[model samples]
Every structure is written in C-alpha cells, then in structure tokens.
Target: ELALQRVRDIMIPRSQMITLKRNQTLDECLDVIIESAHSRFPVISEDKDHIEGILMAKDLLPFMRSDAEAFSMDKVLRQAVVVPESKRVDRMLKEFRSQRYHMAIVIDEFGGVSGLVTIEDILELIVGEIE
Candidate 1:
C-alpha cells in the first residue's frame, strides 16, 4: 500500500530540467537527451522566457535520418505541442491519447516555460498495482 500510495502521492515535480533554445542546434538537444535519457523535453526561447513547444525523441527521427540541410531542428521542432502547467496529468493523458502527442510544454502562471511532461511520465504514475 505504501508503494502504491507513494506513487500516487508523488507529483513527480520537475527539477533540473534541460531546455532547448529556439535557435539551438539539434546536436545540443541530442546531447541533453543522451545524458538524461528523457524521451521528451521542453523547447524554450531565451532561457525559458517563453514556452515554445515540446520535442520528442521519436519526432527527431526523420531529421536524423535525412541528409537535407532543411531538416534542421527548427524545421522539425515546429511540431512541438504547448500546454499549461495547471493541467492535470489525467487530462493531459487523455489529450495525448486523442491527439497522438507524446509530449507537452508546461507553462507557468507568467506564461513562461516551467518544465516538460511526457506520456511516459504520466504512465509511471499508475504503473504499480495497489492491493
């Protein structure tokens, strides 16, 4: 019960998050992804000054496999989805399911990029069974 309850109680607060600048290169984002093993990350402008979008590992596959210079991070990154921080995981999960989105950019009350959340993050919340 404690394990199950702990999982539920744990809000999985975002800390030590890695963000990508609007003009940052794909190599930079890839570095963070490799170090953190995070499937998704929030894209920000000027150090979280604005919440641009959410980038996913799978979303970058096309560009990674392409030889076209036009396939830069900025090009593929435009597909990132923006979401508010006040949104609940359950609600966001539903949207992810319906919209086929795996990541969401969490915005603060001041409309700044706060952190990032992914489909896997929410799934971890309910992965354990309670007795």
Candidate 2:
C-alpha cells in the first residue's frame, strides 16, 4: 500500500525547509512567514540541527494589533515533535492524529535533523483512510 512508505520517502529535505531563526526580529520573522505562506515553521538557533521550537503563523496575529504587547518568540513557540526517518508513514499518521501535531522534524540515524514531514503529506498517501 502507498501507506507503507517510510518518512524519508516523502519528507521535505532539510535543504528545502523554510525555517526561521529564533533570534530574528519580529519584522524579519513576519517577512519569512509572509513570503513562505506557511502556517508552521521550525525555529532554530545557530543552525538547522538545533531547533528551538515550532512557530505557528497564527500566533503572530495577536501581536499585530497596535495596542498589543511586543512579540517574543518564546511567547508563541510550541513544542517540537520529532520522529525518525525510518518510521512508517502509517504509524506517522497515527501519531500525528493522536498527538494533534501537524508537523514533525525527522532525524537521521545519527540523531541529526534530516528532514520534515507533515500530516498533510502522510494523509495524501492514504486518502481513503480519512474518516
């Protein structure tokens, strides 16, 4: 079945990932978010191998107001979900649903960040499984 694939089979490679730096200015963060039109991003420090957390674009909305308090990365960051590249797509989908997380960072055999996989990707592989 198409669902029998491994995460590495469909994950977005690290070189192609659109990430944000944890220390970037709010305007810089906004620029990347707007340019990518992506809802979630892996916030990193120093390098991609060091992920700080996940940032949801929606979280920035509240800070856009003129009267809203200043925005801080820590205030909007969400815990990152990590998974192995060898994990089966079926199990990946199951965990995504149970954990209520849409994206997960993939790790290689050396425990280094390798890629990223989203629920959308896994779901597209087994459209018939949707309830």
Candidate 3:
C-alpha cells in the first residue's frame, strides 16, 4: 500500500547530509554541531565513501571532563541501521522503535550510501507533523 512506502519516497537527500570523519577530534566535532542545526551526523571514512555509523550529539556527555585531543567523536558512534533504499518505510519505523533508534541509512544497489531517514520523517508523512 502507499502508506507503507519505501525510504526514497521520503528521505533527506545525501547532498544535504552533515557528517563527520572517524579521524576528527571531539573539539572539531563540537565546532561543526555548534554551527549546524542537526543533532546527529553520519560517521564516514576518510574518503567519505565508506559508511561507518551514526553519531549522536548527546554522546559527547563525557566530553566536558575528558580531553578532546584524547578522544574521537566516532568513538561514541551509534550502531548503524542501514537498509537498501527499496526497504519498506513501515518496517523501518518498526525497526527504529524496537531498536530505540531515531535514524536509518539507505544504501543503493551498488553498495553506495544514499540518504538518511528518521522517525520524524516517516511520522510527518503519516500525521503531517513538521520536523
């Protein structure tokens, strides 16, 4: 049914995505978040083509007492919930709630990471809630 659509039907394009590299220090990550409105960012490889995982801004809690130089933001990366772009959005919603995740990564057939989705994105389609 149309209600149970695919991720591409309503996903934030990869071009607009904000991401961080595994090599970035916690201090650099702080500057990026302070300038952007996003609370989460995808962790990518040095080439930016490899998907590592997700990183939540809240994961920086210990940062206050820890040395930024001694730690990497990717150290607190969230487990990635990656799925093919064709995966059903409804099932994704279920996975998110059950796994206690807020975002999902969509990959293409060639194994290329495409876009990202969130519970808010799907809910907006169903209940017309703005995110």
Candidate 4:
C-alpha cells in the first residue's frame, strides 16, 4: 500500500519562506536572494497574504546588468500553481512531475497562503537525506 501524507507536513512555513513584492528594486532582490540562497521566491501582493506569483532566480540573472534603475515584477513574474495544504503529498508529487514544476504555492482551505513546496523537497523527504 502507498503511504499518504498531507502537504503541510512538508511545506516550508510562510515565516521561513522567502518572498518578494512587486516593483522592488533589483539590488534588494539580489541581496535577499544571496542571503537566503533560494532558487525561487514567491511574489506577494499588497497584503502579503496573497501570492501574486513565483519568480525564478535564473530569470533575473540576465537583468542583473540591465541599465534600468528599477524593475517591476510584471516583467519577470511567472504564474505559480496553487494547492491546498490539506492535499495529499503523493498526489501533489504527480502534479509536479506531469507539469514539470519545481514549486507550488500552498494555500489553506480558506485560500490564505500557508507556504510553498518544491519537488526537491519531496525527493529529499523520500530519501530521508535531511529534514
């Protein structure tokens, strides 16, 4: 039989998750990314409770040298998939593979952003390499 678990069991909490806001300065993003060393960050809305989208570090790599003084998230933001926190991890795993996605925005039943999960996180959990 297959073991099933809730996505919350493995989701990175919002408090620990790195996030970015729309229209942030490039220097700000770079500094935060360097400190957190995360490959991706969730773009948040005005309230910070709603996830606007997701942004990849690699996507901003080319813009690091751009002559622009400021940048808007509208240009680099990529849509992010939303999933319920109570959803089964095994099922989410399939979605990740089929969709070829590495990250997902986790929301509570009420639609509040709880956190996020990544494909790497699942693999790491399955192998029990680190918690």
Best prediction by lDDT: 2
- Per-residue lDDT for 41-103 in model 3, tens only? 888886445768888888787666656544565468777778888988888888888988788
Candidate ranking under TM-score, highest first, comes to: 2, 4, 3, 1
Q: Total clashes, candidate 3?
A: 0
Please give each candidate's TM-score.
Answer: 0.68, 0.92, 0.85, 0.87
Please provide the root mean square deviation of candidate 1 (C-alpha atoms, Å).
Answer: 4.5
lDDT of each: 0.63, 0.90, 0.78, 0.83
Candidate 4's displacement at residue 105, Å, is 0.9
- Give the 10-residue window scoring lowest on summed lDDT in candidate 2: 122-131
After superposing candidate 4, which stretches have Cα over 4 Å from the reference? 1-3, 64-71, 129-131
The total of clashing pairs for model 4 equals 0
> Cα deviation in Å at residue 102, candidate 2?
0.2
lDDT of 1 by residue, 15-102 (tens): 5566676776778878888898877666767665565666777777776555845446566565567666666556777787999876
Candidates by lDDT, descending order: 2, 4, 3, 1
Candidate number with the higher lDDT (3 or 4)? 4
Candidate number achieving the greatest TM-score relative to the actual structure: 2
In Å, residue 32's CA in model 1 sits off its true spot by 2.0
Better of 2 and 3 by lDDT: 2
Q: Any runs in candidate 2 off by more than 4 Å, and if so which?
A: 128-131
